[PDB]
């Protein structure tokens, strides 16, 4: 099954839309689960993501205008137990150990962060951590290296393929990292 | 002197042997080693290409010893060693049978070899998957259709992936299995399928197992 | 509907005209505000935020222009002052949360840029939020989020001198204790543990504080606020959340955090754990601990 992980859009605050090629890709009828890290911020962008898939799991992100989104969240999909959080909640913003702390407190196999606008994915003490980065590729004070990215997972079962979609230039350069339950 | 290159002979002699090996499974497993060796070894380097072929003399004499041989007596400055890594044994820049082309061939035969007695899921796969995709799949069925990975074949590249949302794993390794080459392979796939398909004229698990590789959304 | 379309169309415009001449951009932005910070309190609310971000970007653009422009440092100021005026005009349209963070991301911005007469515009942006914090932030729910942001925002920043770091550090400590509820205090106080360690400040040439003692202060204080939570389920989880946050500070080579504290903190939590009823809320924290054993087990 296909899990679309993204976030940090900041519409309209920091960016007027998603990059042409990304909107062109993300069509309805190819996704079952979405795990958005936030900063949508508007209803406009909630209603986009609800079109794309049946299941949709937002979190509360520092600039979100809706209150009703949940700060922290977890979901079991397949064999996997995933953790999801916008990531400003973790201090020091996007440190290692703080993101591991948050794993233990959650007891999750996968843990999605955000806020840095910078993609990462890696294995650390037999548990996985993701961050799709900016879908829009929006501003950030701390970084000026912004590569519009979103992630797709293929959880087969006891085996997750972690595709990362980046937009370098005007081409869509995709890499892949496979992780599997210990 | 000796002023005609063994290139064409060797090339042709593989096609002869591959034919024999379709039946003889002990010759097949023996041939695979030979093909793998040429593939792994680098036709950029001249000597090594000559080396690796000559090192398999024991195999080049199983079918046709006429490949390796030359009259070592009565020729000054064409001693036995000197010939086997010379331009005369195998011309580095033969306009037709370029070391490169023999490599590019070798692989073609490698895939065709393992094709011979591979299963129905395999054949069907090789037909559906497009030029780019088919190359990937050949890695994906390692090492049955041959060892194609970054270090076991010289010209082989890193597997790349599409923007299409379920992202298909592909390859753009044209410097081994050319779009031309791969088209031949498909041809031999459906040859091998069609030929197999006639010999059970009602039902059975081929026609269940075909329906499984075919209806796979 | 009439408020959703119009707000898209200012996103569009500042981009339509986009030049690569910095000063031209500035004229545009200016000429945006002129013509899109007008219509009552209906638009000005959710129309200016763009421009404020968009300004910060342009401020960065002047730092790429390191050698090309001499008056870039003065042009940074020109921009930030353009923010101040623009965030304020949200306050004057009675707004609280949005302008608070808009100051913060600005406050970060100047911080990372590092221009002439910048540290002065760093403080001013921070305290402007803080002045909005205490003045207009009620509901203990969003009172928490609104304070934790301010903390981690600051935490990151390296652009402050000790002389102006200290007051904002403990300005947080106040706001940490000044929360309504008991759990929300005890966590928030422990969140203020960082600012005294990895909260950077240009004093040892852009390095961490390494002030291990002032961490222990803000970890003790929480543990006391841990007893002062009535519920047994609060108490145990809060001990554990503080235990893990103790651990972190050991693993970061801080020798202020010693084993004595930890074993005593552990032992306590071994014994308290059985008292909770065998149920869903209880089936979580007994795993949390199990995972904090094994993490400590390797290390």
- In whole angstroms, give the CA distance from residue B206 to residue B121: 10
DSSP string, B129-189: S-HHHHHHHHHHTTTTS---SBTTBSS----EE-SSSS--EE---TTTS-HHHHHHHHHHH
- In whole angstroms, give the CA distance from residue B127 to residue B133: 10
- Convert C34-74 into a string of H (helix), E (strand) and C (coil): HHHCCCCCCCHHHHHHHHHHHHHHHHHHHHHCCCCCCCHHH
DSSP state of A67: S
Q: Is C47 inside a domain boundary?
A: yes
Least CA distance to A142: which residue of chain C? C112
- In whole angstroms, give the CA distance from residue C211 to residue C196: 6
Question: Looking up tokens 């002065």, which residue turns up?
Answer: C120
Q: Is C166 inside a domain boundary?
A: no
Q: Assign residue C81 the CATH number of its domain.
A: 1.25.40.660
Residues in contact with C143: Cβ distance below 8 Å, sequence separation at least 6, in sequence order? C137, C179, C180, C184
Cβ neighbours of A149 in B, within 8 Å: none
Q: Does B151 touch chain A (CB under 8 A)?
A: no
Partner chains of B (3+ C-beta pairs under 8 Å): A
Q: Does C18 touch chain A (CB under 8 A)?
A: no
Three-class DSSP category at A171? strand
Phi, psi of A120 (to 5 degrees): -145, 150
Q: Does A3 touch chain B (CB under 8 A)?
A: no
Q: Does C162 touch chain A (CB under 8 A)?
A: no
Contact A174/B166, CB-based, under 8 Å?
A: no
Contact B166/A2, CB-based, under 8 Å?
A: yes
Instruction: Output the CA torsion sign for C245, C250, C256, C259.
Output: positive
Q: Which of B166, B167, B217 to mutate to test the interface with A (most CBs of A within 10 A)?
A: B167
Q: Which of A14, A94, A102, A104 to mutate to test the interface with C (most CBs of C within 10 A)?
A: A104
Q: Is A124 annotated as a binding residue?
A: no
Neighbour count for residue C203 (Cβ, 10 Å): 14
Reported structure resolution in angstroms: 4.3
As given in the structure block, the two tokens for residue C33 are 């505000």
DSSP state of A134: B
**Residue A12: is the preceding peptide bond cis (ω within 30°)?**
yes
Three-class DSSP category at A35? strand
CA geometry: angle at B6 spanning B3 and B9, to 5°? 130
CB-based contact A64:A76 (threshold 8 Å): no
| Domains of chain A in sequence order | 1-182 (3.60.21.10)
Q: Report the relative pairing of strands A149-155 and B169-170 from DSSP bridges.
A: unpaired
CB-based contact B161:B168 (threshold 8 Å): yes
**Residue A92: is the preceding peptide bond cis (ω within 30°)?**
yes
Q: Which of residues 43-72 of A touch B (CB under 8 A)?
A: none
Which is nearest to B83 in space by CA: B97, B99, B95, B67?
B67
Q: Is C235 inside a domain boundary?
A: no
DSSP state of C195: G
Q: Does A152 touch chain B (CB under 8 A)?
A: yes
Question: What are the CA-CA distances from residue B139 to residues A155, B40, B113 (Å)?
Answer: 22, 14, 15
Least CA distance to A177: which residue of chain B? B161
Q: Is C68 inside a domain boundary?
A: yes
Count how many domains chain C has. 1
- In whole angstroms, give the CA distance from residue A16 to residue A85: 24
| First vs last C-alpha separation in chain C | 56
Q: Is C60 inside a domain boundary?
A: yes
Q: Is C151 inside a domain boundary?
A: no
- In whole angstroms, give the CA distance from residue C220 to residue C192: 12
- In whole angstroms, give the CA distance from residue A152 to residue A171: 18
Cβ neighbours of C142 in A, within 8 Å: 67
No. of H helices and E strands in chain A?
3, 11
DSSP state of C179: S
Least CA distance to B167: which residue of chain A? A163
* Radius of gyration for chain A, computed over Cα atoms and rounded to the nearest angstrom: 15
Domain range for residue C83?
A: 1-136
Which is nearest to B35 in space by CA: B83, B131, B93, B102?
B102
Residues in contact with A47: Cβ distance below 8 Å, sequence separation at least 6, in sequence order? none
Q: Counting every residue, how long is chain A?
A: 182
Q: Is C218 inside a domain boundary?
A: no
- In whole angstroms, give the CA distance from residue C199 to residue B217: 53
Cβ neighbours of A175 in B, within 8 Å: 161
- In whole angstroms, give the CA distance from residue C43 to residue C50: 12
Task: Mark whether C and B touch (3+ CB pairs within 8 Å).
Answer: no
Q: At what angle do helices C72-91 and C119-136 cross, to 10 degrees?
A: 10
DSSP state of A19: -
């Amino acid at each position: 099954m296909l899990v679309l992980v993204l976030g940090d859009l900041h519409i309209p605050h920091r960016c007027n839309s998603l990059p042409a090629k990304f909107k062109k890709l993300l069509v309805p009828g190819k996704i079952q689960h979405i795990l958005c890290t936030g900063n949508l911020c508007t209803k406009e962008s909630y209603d986009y993501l609800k079109t794309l898939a049946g299941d949709v799991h937002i979190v509360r992100g520092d600039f979100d205008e809706n209150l009703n989104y949940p700060e922290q969240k977890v979901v079991t999909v397949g064999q996997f137990k995933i953790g999801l959080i916008h990531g400003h909640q973790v201090i020091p913003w996007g440190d290692m150990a703080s993101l591991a702390l948050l794993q233990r407190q959650f007891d999750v196999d996968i843990l999605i962060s955000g806020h840095t606008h910078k993609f990462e994915a890696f294995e650390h003490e037999n548990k996985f951590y993701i961050n799709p980065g900016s879908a829009t590729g929006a501003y950030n004070a701390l970084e000026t290296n912004i590569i519009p990215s979103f992630v797709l997972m293929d959880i087969q079962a006891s085996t997750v393929v972690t595709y990362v979609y980046q937009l370098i230039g005007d081409d869509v350069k995709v890499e892949r990292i496979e992780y599997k339950k210990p | 002197y000796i002023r005609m290159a063994k290139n064409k002979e060797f090339f042709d002699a593989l096609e002869e042997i591959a034919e024999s090996a379709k039946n003889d499974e002990t010759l097949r497993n023996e041939l695979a080693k030979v093909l793998d060796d040429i593939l792994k070894t680098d036709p950029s380097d001249p000597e090594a290409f000559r080396k690796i072929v000559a090192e398999h003399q024991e195999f080049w004499d199983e079918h046709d010893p006429s490949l390796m041989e030359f009259n070592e007596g009565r020729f000054f400055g064409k001693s036995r060693k000197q010939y086997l890594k010379s331009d005369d044994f195998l011309n580095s820049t033969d306009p037709t049978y370029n070391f490169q082309k023999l490599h590019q061939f070798a692989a073609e035969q490698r895939v065709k070899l393992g094709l011979e007695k591979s299963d129905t899921d395999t054949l069907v796969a090789i037909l559906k998957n497009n030029p780019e995709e088919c190359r990937a799949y050949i890695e994906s069925k390692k090492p049955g259709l041959g060892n194609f990975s970054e270090g076991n074949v010289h010209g082989w590249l890193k597997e790349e992936y599409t923007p299409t949302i379920p992202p298909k794993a592909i390859n753009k390794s044209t410097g081994v299995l050319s779009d031309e080459a791969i088209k031949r392979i498909k041809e031999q796939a459906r040859d091998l399928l069609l030929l197999k398909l006639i010999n059970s004229s009602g039902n059975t698990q081929l026609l269940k197992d075909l329906r499984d590789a075919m209806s796979k959304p | 509907e009439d408020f959703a379309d119009e707000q898209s169309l200012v996103g569009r415009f500042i981009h339509l005209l986009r030049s690569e001449d910095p000063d031209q951009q500035y004229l545009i932005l200016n000429t945006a505000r002129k013509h899109f910070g007008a219509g009552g309190n209906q638009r000005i609310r959710f129309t200016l935020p763009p421009l404020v971000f968009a300004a910060y970007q342009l401020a960065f653009r002047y730092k790429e222009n390191s050698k090309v422009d001499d008056k870039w440092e003065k042009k940074c100021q020109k921009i930030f002052s353009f923010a101040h005026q623009t965030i304020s005009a949200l306050i004057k349209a009675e707004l609280a949360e949005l302008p608070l963070r808009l100051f913060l991301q600005g406050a970060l911005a100047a911080g990372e840029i590092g221009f002439e007469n910048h540290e002065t515009v760093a403080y001013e942006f921070m305290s402007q939020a803080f002045s909005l914090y205490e003045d207009e932030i009620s509901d203990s729910k969003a009172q928490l989020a609104a304070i934790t942001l301010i903390i981690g925002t600051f935490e990151r920043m390296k652009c402050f001198s000790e002389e102006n770091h200290e007051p904002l550090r403990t300005q947080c400590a106040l706001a940490a204790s000044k929360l309504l509820k008991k759990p929300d205090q005890g966590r928030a106080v422990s969140t203020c543990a960082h600012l005294f360690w990895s909260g950077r400040n240009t004093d040892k040439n852009g390095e961490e504080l390494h002030g291990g003692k002032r961490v222990m202060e803000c970890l003790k204080k929480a543990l006391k606020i841990a007893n002062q939570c009535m519920d047994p389920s609060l108490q145990v989880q809060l001990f554990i959340e503080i235990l893990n946050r103790y651990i972190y500070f050991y693993e970061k080579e801080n020798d202020a955090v010693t084993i004595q504290v930890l074993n005593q903190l552990i032992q306590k939590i071994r014994e308290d754990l059985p008292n909770l009823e065998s149920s869903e809320e209880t089936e979580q924290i007994n795993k949390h601990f199990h995972n904090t054993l094994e993490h400590l087990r390797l290390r």
